Structures are given as C-alpha cells and as structure tokens.
C-alpha cells in the first residue's frame, strides 16, 4: 500500500495535491435531498467538497465517505492544521480523495 | 455542485437563509416515539428543528439527518458560533436543511 | 412540531418535567444482558434511566435510544448543565424521554 | 430497573464490584482476528477486559459492547476518574459488565 | 484472554511489537476507491497503516478496523502518546493489529 498521501494521490487520474498548511476557515454541511454533502473553505480562498454518494462510488467507499465528513467536522472544531489534500479536479468544487495532517 | 450554503439553499423551494452568527442558546433532544427530533434556540428568540425522519425524506437523507443532529450537539457543547442556517420555512419550527460555521 | 421540551412532554401520558438545572453527578453504563442501559443521578438524589430497548419501543426509537445515551455520556464528561428532563413516571427509576440544556 | 451499579451488578452471579476511584493507566485495543477486544489497566495493577463479541452474548449486547469500548477510550483520553466497575470474575482478565463514574 | 499487547501480539505469526513512546507525527486518511485506509508516521521514520478491508479479514474484524481508525484519529488530534504497536510485518507499510497507550 502507499506510504504517503502524494503516492496514494498519484495512483488516481484527475487529481492534484493542494498543500494547505492551515486550519479550516468554514464548514458547511447539508442534509438536503440530493445534496447530502459537506463543503470546506480556507483563507487561501480554496473551496472543496466531500461529494454526495453516487454511482461513481464503490461499496467499500460508503463508510469512508462518512468517515471523511466526520474528520472534517472535528478538524474544523479543534482548529487542527490540514497539511495536504488529494483532490479530484474533475469536479467543482474540487472533491476530497484524501487528507493529511502533521505536527 | 454548490460552493456555498446560499447557493445550495437556493436550489430548493420553501427555504430561506438565516444569518445567525451566534452560538446555540439551548439544545433539546427527544427519544419519545414519533418525536425523535432535536430543537435548538438562539438568544434572538428563533427556534429551529431537525425533523423526525419521515416519508418526505429519501433514503440518502437518513444518515445525513443523523449527522446533522450530531453536529448540533457538538456545536452546542463547544459554544461554536453558527454562521448561516438554510431552513425549510413550510414547517414550524423551521426545519434545518443546512448549516455553516466560520472561524 | 413542538417548539419546547415542555410542549413535547405534554403530548405524552404518564410523563412530567423535572427542572434539573445542574450537571450530572454520576453516570452508569451497563452492557450486561437484558440490562443494556444507562443510569444518571444528580446531587439532589434524583435518579433517571435510559431504559433497555424492549417491546414498548418502535423502530424509529432504536437510533434515538442510542443517541440519548451518547448525549448523556458527553454531557457528563463535559460537566454540562442539564436544564430539564421529560421523563415517564410509570417506571422506576423514571425513564428519560427528552432532555434540554441551555447556555 | 436497578438504581445504582451495585444493585444492577447484584442481579448477576459470578460478578463483583471493584471500586476504582481512579483514571485509567493504560488502554489497549486490538483488531486482530478473534482478539477484537480492549484491555484496561490501573496503577493499582488491576486489569480488565471488554471481551471479544461471541456466543456468550445475546443480540442486544452487541451495540452495548461497542458502546463500552467507546466509553473506555474517551474516559482514558480525558483522564476521567472511574468510580466502580461491575465485572464477571469467571474470566481472566476479569470482564466488564458495567461502569460508573462520579463527579 | 490476553492481558497485555505483547501477549496478544505473540499469538500471531508475522507480527512484532514496535515500542513507540511518542505521539503520532502525521495522520493521513483516504476515501479513494480501493485505498480506503489510514496511514500514520512517527518522527522515528516509522510508517504504519490500517489496511483496506479485504479477503484476509474475517467478519468480526469489520467493526474493529473502523474502531482502530477512529482511535488513530482521536489519538493524533489529542497528541496522546502511543506506548506500543503490534503490527504484521508481511505488509508495507507494516499493518496495525493492536495499539496501547499509557498515562
Ligand atoms: O482512478 C481511479 N482509480 C485508480 C486506481 C484503481 C485501483 C488501484 C489504484 C488506482 C478511479 C476509479 C473509480 C472512480 C474514479 O473517479 C471518479 O469517482 C471518484 C470517487 O470515487 C470521484 O468522484 C472522481 O471525480 C470521479 O472521476 C477514479
Ligand atoms: O425542492 C426539492 N428538491 C429540489 C431539488 C431536487 C433535486 C436536486 C436538487 C434540488 C425537494 C424534494 C423533496 C422534498 C422537499 O421538501 C420537503 O422535504 C424536506 C425534507 O427532505 C422538508 O421536510 C420540507 O419541509 C418538505 O417540504 C423538497
Ligand atoms: O403516550 C404515547 N404516545 C403519544 C404520542 C404518540 C405518537 C406521537 C406523538 C405522541 C406512548 C406511546 C407508546 C409508548 C408510550 O409509553 C411507553 O413506552 C415509553 C417509551 O417509548 C416508556 O417506556 C413508557 O414507560 C411506556 O409507558 C407512550
Ligand atoms: O447471569 C446472567 N444473567 C442474569 C440472570 C440470568 C439468569 C437468571 C437470573 C439472572 C448471565 C446471562 C448470560 C451470560 C452470562 O455470563 C456469561 O456471559 C457474560 C457476557 O454476557 C460474560 O462473558 C460471563 O463471563 C459469561 O459467564 C450471565
Ligand atoms: O495468525 C493468525 N491468527 C492466529 C490466531 C488465531 C486465533 C486466535 C489468536 C491468534 C491470523 C489469522 C488470520 C489472518 C492472519 O493474517 C493476515 O490477515 C491480517 C489481518 O487479519 C493481516 O492482513 C496479515 O498481514 C495477513 O497475513 C493471521
């Protein structure tokens, strides 16, 4: 298996690493039908989403999508620095594939 | 693919944005049958609920409804200020569709 | 829907409101068979339970039962003041139907 | 229903109350196959387990076992003092049936 | 059952105990398809994973794998010192079977 977020990110097409090195600026969560999602933004001006579960997802990602939203919320509430995000850039806003935190 | 809570909220009928910019004053939770819900209030006097899950909800909303109630509880306990709420105004108290928070 | 704990409590028979206005003194949790329950006590001497899930509950209460024990646990740990409890008084100790907290 | 951990522990044979009055010294968690369990220790030298889910447990205990592991972890991390444990003494290490915390 | 992580770790082949005695330096989480995993690193240069769920896992490990990832996230966020890690050394990064922490 991969040893870092960049190596893992490099296995997927349509992705890029954003080096954030900052805590989350805003956290938005929706339970509106067909828009069950989370959106985060940074002072840098970037906006990112955890996509609504769909047909591009495989069954093993169900729990992982929910785990990623949980992580973003607690990270926001604890003011924890995000290091990097591995995102899919074929979506707007860019879609989170993975996150890393350090220190 | 909305990038803000206002863009998201505008995709639905019977919704309006409330700019709360304040922490939750009170948190109420019920496990009584047919009233499995959460009620929150603010010092402005405005009251909101997360609705009891029902026929108006699609199955993709089930985990999202549970997530929203989780978020309100930790938000209340941490004194986290809420920025905006997107709420369905055809229910009393108005019903939360989305929440945002910024730091 | 109800807008307050007292209005919601009043929809049910054999219930009453206890205005606690205090933090939980003690928290007990059991995973023993047929005693899968939580008991809270207050400095006042009053004791309440979240009952073991049984034939009196409906399917929609299953997750709400688990949420109320989740809430009491984090309320205890954070030493958060409870405002009111809506309880059924046809059980001993009285059984929790709803809780409210205010800051 | 029982009103205290000692009353509830008394409803079962092969149990005893250990009075702890202390925070957990060590927390151990395993996801190894057939050893999915948690072991806690105290500076007294006393050691307890949450057993691996199995044939000795009825269905209503499955979510309660997972809740006990969650309470041990958050209690460990917050340094919360444990009051009492009700344990089965026909297991080594003794097996947790219930826990209480006070103040 | 086992009373310590070393006992437990010794029941399996292809394992070893790493004495960490340190907080987690970095936490990485991926919801990317086929890489639904967590990776952690230490200032020692060691890197460990919670493997993606696969054919090597039995059903009882499903919830425990999700629990271990929950534990690594809250351990990271709180800067809780890990004592030991029991890992399978037939995977890269080495794969976590159990963790211990002491206060
Ligand atoms: O590139 C992919 N896989 C590469 C891979 C597979 C196996 C091993 C290693 C690498 C891959 C596979 C399935 C879907 C996929 O990507 C798609 O779905 C994603 C969510 O899962 C995002 O929504 C992306 O925007 C969408 O393009 C990307
Ligand atoms: O307006 C809606 N959808 C627009 C839409 C459709 C598809 C994608 C994005 C937006 C829509 C769809 C189903 C129900 C709905 O609204 C209804 O259900 C809500 C809970 O989900 C609330 O309880 C509202 O009070 C109730 O009026 C509103
Ligand atoms: O009084 C009730 N309902 C009024 C009501 C029904 C539906 C919607 C709103 C209000 C009602 C319905 C079913 C059980 C009930 O009460 C029963 O179950 C409770 C737990 O749910 C407690 O265990 C009470 O001790 C037991 O009497 C009380
Ligand atoms: O004593 C029990 N129930 C109380 C009771 C039973 C029967 C009559 C009266 C009271 C009881 C029931 C089922 C199992 C039980 O105990 C068993 O399983 C426990 C976990 O559930 C532990 O693993 C104990 O070590 C094991 O002996 C103890
Ligand atoms: O050696 C094993 N078990 C010994 C054992 C059995 C019963 C009780 C206690 C110990 C054992 C059993 C099943 C799988 C196993 O190991 C395998 O799966 C692991 C995850 O479960 C890791 O992925 C290891 O890398 C892979 O070899 C190792």
Walk me through what this model shows.
- Five copies of one chain form a homopentamer.
- Helix content of chain A is 23%, strand content 37%.
- The first copy, chain A, is α+β, with helices and mostly antiparallel strands.
- Chain A has a single domain (1-103), classed as OB fold (Dihydrolipoamide Acetyltransferase, E2P).
- In chain A, strand 5 (82-88) and strand 6 (94-102) form a beta hairpin.
- The longest helix of chain A has 18 residues, at 61-78.
- The first copy, chain A, starts with a helix and ends with a strand.
- The interface between C and D is medium-sized, with 28 and 33 residues.
Summarize the structure.
Five copies of one chain form a homopentamer. By secondary structure, chain A is α+β, with helices and mostly antiparallel strands.
Write the layout of secondary structure elements.
The structure is a homopentamer.
Chain A: H1 5-10, E1 15-22, E2 26-30, E3 37-41, E4 47-50, H2 61-78, E5 82-88, E6 94-102
Parallel strand pairs in A: 4-6
Antiparallel strand pairs in A: 1-5, 2-3, 3-4, 5-6
The complex binds N-benzyl-3-(alpha-D-galactos-1-yl)-benzamide (AI1) (5 copies).
One N-benzyl-3-(alpha-D-galactos-1-yl)-benzamide (AI1) binds near residues 61 and 95 of chain D.
The class by helix and strand makeup of chain A works out as alpha+beta
CATH topology assignment of chain A: OB fold (Dihydrolipoamide Acetyltransferase, E2P)
Distance between the termini of chain A: 23 Å
- Shape by Cα distribution of chain A: globular
CATH class division of chain A: Mainly Beta
Biggest interface goes to:
B-C, 31 and 34 residues
Strand order of the largest sheet of chain A: 1-5-6-4-3-2
* Proportion of strand residues of chain A: 35-45%
Subunit structure (chains A, B, C, D, E): Heterohexamer of one A chain and of five B chains.
Function (chains A, B, C, D, E): The biological activity of the toxin is produced by the A chain, which activates intracellular adenyl cyclase.
Protein name (chains A, B, C, D, E): Heat-labile enterotoxin B chain
Disulfide bonds (chains A, B, C, D, E): 9-86
């Amino acid at each position: 298996a991969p040893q870092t977020i960049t190596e893992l990110c490099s296995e997927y097409r349509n992705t890029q690493i954003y080096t954030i090195n900052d805590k989350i600026l805003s956290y938005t969560e929706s339970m509106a039908g067909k828009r069950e999602m989370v959106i985060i933004t940074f002072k840098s001006g970037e906006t990112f989403q955890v996509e609504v579960p769909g047909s591009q997802h495989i069954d093993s990602q169900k729990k992982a999508i929910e785990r990623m939203k949980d992580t973003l919320r607690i990270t926001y509430l604890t003011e924890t620095k995000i290091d990097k995000l591995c995102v899919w850039n074929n979506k707007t806003p860019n879609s989170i594939a993975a996150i890393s935190m350090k220190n």
